[PDB]
């Protein structure tokens, strides 16, 4: 059904490696109640299996937040 | 001569040893030179910006 809808409406339809670079910016703002801080490395791409243990690795160091009951 | 000698037994030692410094000084202070501006080019390479919401 998806498929002949879409060949109803959608068939009247035409027909840069980016660079990682080591860095950083500081926009200080001692008014702000807390400070943000944001640091990462560059990663792999979509397509990469490198993202399966990654992730892993990264649910190694978890997530907190002071609302956490642990 | 003799009494160059006498008086500075270490004349050749040390004209030796100051060769050697001289050596190892000339190729550690480029080096240390060199590390001393890997480390200081964050701060000079660096550029301030002022934002004032106004």
């Not at chain 1, 809808?5 to 027909?15: I, N, P, R, T, V």
């Not at chain 2, 660096?46 to 106004?54: D, G």
Request: glycine share 8%; hydrophobic share 40%.
């Amino acid at each position: 059904q998806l498929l002949d809808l879409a060949q109803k409406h959608f068939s009247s339809l035409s027909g840069t490696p980016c660079r990682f670079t080591g860095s950083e910016i500081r926009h200080r703002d001692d008014a702000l109640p807390l400070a943000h801080v944001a640091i990462a490395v560059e990663g792999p791409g979509w397509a990469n299996p490198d993202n399966v243990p990654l992730q892993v690795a990264n649910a190694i160091i978890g997530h907190y937040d002071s609302t956490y009951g642990g | 001569t003799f009494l160059r000698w006498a008086s500075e037994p270490e004349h050749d030692h040390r004209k030796r040893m100051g060769l050697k410094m001289l050596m190892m000084m000339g190729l550690l202070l480029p080096l240390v030179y060199a590390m001393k501006r890997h480390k200081w080019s964050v701060l000079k390479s660096r550029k301030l910006a002022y934002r004032p919401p106004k």
